[PDB]
Amino acid sequence: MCLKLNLLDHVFANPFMNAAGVLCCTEEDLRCMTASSSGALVSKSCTSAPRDGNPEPRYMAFPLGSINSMGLPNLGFDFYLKYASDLHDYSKKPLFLSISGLSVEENVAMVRRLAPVAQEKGVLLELNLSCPNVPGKPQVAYDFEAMRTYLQQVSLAYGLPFGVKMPPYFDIAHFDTAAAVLNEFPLVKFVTCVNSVGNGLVIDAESESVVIKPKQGFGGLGGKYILPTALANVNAFYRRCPDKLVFGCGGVYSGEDAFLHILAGASMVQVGTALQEEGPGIFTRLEDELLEIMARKGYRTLEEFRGRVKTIE
Amino acid sequence: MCLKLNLLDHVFANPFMNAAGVLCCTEEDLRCMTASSSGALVSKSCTSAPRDGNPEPRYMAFPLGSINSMGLPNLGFDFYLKYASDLHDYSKKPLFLSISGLSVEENVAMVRRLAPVAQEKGVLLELNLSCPNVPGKPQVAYDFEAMRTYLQQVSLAYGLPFGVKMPPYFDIAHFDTAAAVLNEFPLVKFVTCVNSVGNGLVIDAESESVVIKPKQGFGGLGGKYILPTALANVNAFYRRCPDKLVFGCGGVYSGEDAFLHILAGASMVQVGTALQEEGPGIFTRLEDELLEIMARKGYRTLEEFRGRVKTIE
Numbered sequence: 001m002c003l004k005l006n007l008l009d010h011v012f013a014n015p016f017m018n019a020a021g022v023l024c025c026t027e028e029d030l031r032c033m034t035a036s037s038s039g040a041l042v043s044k045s046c047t048s049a050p051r052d053g054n055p056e057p058r059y060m061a062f063p064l065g066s067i068n069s070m071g072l073p074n075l076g077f078d079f080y081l082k083y084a085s086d087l088h089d090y091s092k093k094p095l096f097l098s099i100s101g102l103s104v105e106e107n108v109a110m111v112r113r114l115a116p117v118a119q120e121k122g123v124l125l126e127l128n129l130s131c132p133n134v135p136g137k138p139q140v141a142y143d144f145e146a147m148r149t150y151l152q153q154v155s156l157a158y159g160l161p162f163g164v165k166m167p168p169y170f171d172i173a174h175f176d177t178a179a180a181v182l183n184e185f186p187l188v189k190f191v192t193c194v195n196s197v198g199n200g201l202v203i204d205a206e207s208e209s210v211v212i213k214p215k216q217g218f219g220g221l222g223g224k225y226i227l228p229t230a231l232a233n234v235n236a237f238y239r240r241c242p243d244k245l246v247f248g249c250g251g252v253y254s255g256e257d258a259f260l261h262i263l264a265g266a267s268m269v270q271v272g273t274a275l276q277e278e279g280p281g282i283f284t285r286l287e288d289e290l291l292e293i294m295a296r297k298g299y300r301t302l303e304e305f306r307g308r309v310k311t312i313e
Numbered sequence: 314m315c316l317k318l319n320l321l322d323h324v325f326a327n328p329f330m331n332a333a334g335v336l337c338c339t340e341e342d343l344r345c346m347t348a349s350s351s352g353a354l355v356s357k358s359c360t361s362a363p364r365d366g367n368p369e370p371r372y373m374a375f376p377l378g379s380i381n382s383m384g385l386p387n388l389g390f391d392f393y394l395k396y397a398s399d400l401h402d403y404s405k406k407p408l409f410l411s412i413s414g415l416s417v418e419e420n421v422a423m424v425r426r427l428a429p430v431a432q433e434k435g436v437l438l439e440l441n442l443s444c445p446n447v448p449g450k451p452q453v454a455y456d457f458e459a460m461r462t463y464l465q466q467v468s469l470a471y472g473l474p475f476g477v478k479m480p481p482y483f484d485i486a487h488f489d490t491a492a493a494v495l496n497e498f499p500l501v502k503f504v505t506c507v508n509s510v511g512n513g514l515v516i517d518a519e520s521e522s523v524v525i526k527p528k529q530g531f532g533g534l535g536g537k538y539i540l541p542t543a544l545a546n547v548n549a550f551y552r553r554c555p556d557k558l559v560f561g562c563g564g565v566y567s568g569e570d571a572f573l574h575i576l577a578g579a580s581m582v583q584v585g586t587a588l589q590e591e592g593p594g595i596f597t598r599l600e601d602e603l604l605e606i607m608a609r610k611g612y613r614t615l616e617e618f619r620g621r622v623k624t625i626e
């Protein structure tokens with residue numbers, strides 16, 4: 001029995017990694033994720049220039065999950081490119097690099113510089129089309145024409161395999177249209193479902209006030225709140241994109257939650273809110289818990305149950 | 314201190330009612346809701362002809378809430394019209410009648426016949442533009458041109474005040490567009506936020522199966538999962554429709570949860586999943602709990618805190 005897997009021409013000790021934005025902004029953060037038991041890591045979504053992000057308080061956690069409006073705080077593309085080119089030890093585990101430009105032009109500028117480093121070192125691109133927290137900037141992938149434009153321009157300028165981070169959808173027609181767009185692009189090798197559930201609102205009953213400062217209290221939701229939403233999106237894209245991989249993200253706290261994502265179709269499994277709250281020790285616990293479920297059910301490898309969720313009748 | 318209030322030229326003993334679809338399908342259900350301590354009731358969303366609905370199992374409850382794909386099972390418009398015209402005791406509490414046609418023509422047919430009974434009896438229309446469960450029929454109010462057409466045709470055919478049941482949105486640009494559409498129609502006097510969070514997926518770890526039969530297990534979410542999403546939508550429409558009323562629906566289990574909805578802008582407060590699980594006894598508990606919170610805080614009336622949620626400077 002083992003958790004080993006091979007995909008995208010890389011070898012992984014296990015399917016677990018951080019979700020983009022959690023424990024991955026500074027060199028210190030990245031070294032910490034590398035020293036953990038995780039199978040891989042991804043860097044903070046970056047822009048051409050460094051950003052301070054939105055005013056504090058901008059993150060708050062609760063029993064059922066988290067709300068945030070960070071505002072894309074990051075050290076700038078030059079820093080994350082240098083980490084991938086000169087600093088990361090690829091003998092420990094694979095590295096993904098996330099980008100989130102504020103226009104199609106900004107993304108194209110970054111991928112032109114990323115390409116030679118990807119060719120030499122094997123760093124893997126995750127393109128973020130789902131940030132719900134920059135004021136005046138609605139989620140790119142909720143506009144299918146803008147989506148098609150970003151993907152055409154990036155494919156042409158990069159010319160190498162990449163993946164896409166998607167927002168959650170709630171409508172069968174939207175699942176149908178979005179997956180069809182993705183299937184037009186052979187360079188898109190993986191689809192990560194999902195980013196935060198956008199523009200929720202948490203209110204404190206005692207103080208009668210919202211709990212985060214930006215955007216009048218409105219922010220993206222993660223954790224226990226979003227698990228059935230995340231599983232729905234993972235399965236919807238697994239069914240509709242049979243020639244691509246799907247990565248699961250949303251509501252993972254336990255080996256059982258990871259088992260459900262994998263049954264739905266997930267290859268890698270990403271951990272956000274639960275990692276932010278518990279710290280990187282979570283990865284040894286998730287491995288132990290998934291192996292014990294597999295033992296009890298008589299499963300020896302991940303391929304024996306990936307995508308095998310059963311429907312009724 | 315009492316919770317009585319006046320809205321839409323009617324008097325209500327308190328702000329509580331059932332959510333459409335819960336405890337309101339049969340004559341028995343409607344009599345039971347009328348005998349409860351609720352301030353009002355709403356009937357099951359209806360169609361021109363009787364419907365059996367989707368195959369069973371089609372509803373399942375869990376610690377954090379519920380999933381359903383009912384498929385609009387109902388006794389037919391003729392039955393609910395007769396209940397409103399001949400059977401309901403208007404001396405006990407006001408009645409709302411919900412309609413959910415599968416086309417614009419079907420809704421228009423129903424409202425032409427509802428109009429004389431609304432004139433004579435004072436029954437109030439709730440028009441459902443957000444059912445997420447009928448195969449091949451996407452949520453009407455996620456298509457803004459369809460939404461506008463429904464409201465134009467219904468306004469002309471009915472000619473009397475009414476309200477609209479809305480789906481949840483997750484995008485600031487969508488809040489902006491949807492509220493602008495609503496503000497084109499003076500006859501729309503109330504907006505109910507929200508219907509279920511559409512097309513989630515619950516999976517049982519032991520059996521490795523989805524838990525409902527229709528639509529390969531995909532169904533609408535209610536309960537603890539959806540409270541921050543519901544509060545966001547109530548506040549967004551309260552801010553953008555200052556000349557209309559907003560009714561809150563989603564994630565209400567306690568007087569505290571009702572207090573948060575009212576602070577966000579709610580006039581009436583609807584109860585779905587919690588009512589389905591606990592039964593009509595819930596209404597005496599919600600009233601007692603809300604009055605206690607008001608006394609502790611020194612609030613004599615609902616008007617003193619409605620819409621008064623504080624933001625961070």
Ligand SMILES: Cc1cc2nc3c(=O)[nH]c(=O)nc-3n(C[C@H](O)[C@H](O)[C@H](O)COP(=O)(O)O)c2cc1C
Nearest residue numbers: 019020021045194195196222223250251271272273
């Ligand atoms: C503090 C915070 C920062 C985040 N930053 C990013 C980001 O930089 N890029 C991105 O694609 N997602 C970002 N996310 C979204 C997460 O990657 C993830 O999609 C989401 O939190 C849902 O997973 P969860 O339920 O495990 O939290 C962030 C989330 C939080 C909590």
Ligand SMILES: Cc1cc2nc3c(=O)[nH]c(=O)nc-3n(C[C@H](O)[C@H](O)[C@H](O)COP(=O)(O)O)c2cc1C
Nearest residue numbers: 332333334358507508509535536563564584585586
């Ligand atoms: C059993 C079931 C049936 C429902 N039927 C309807 C319906 O006929 N019309 C409608 O507008 N909403 C219907 N709903 C949605 C609810 O009115 C409500 O919007 C949703 O359940 C969220 O509120 P909650 O968190 O209190 O459950 C139904 C929900 C459930 C649980």
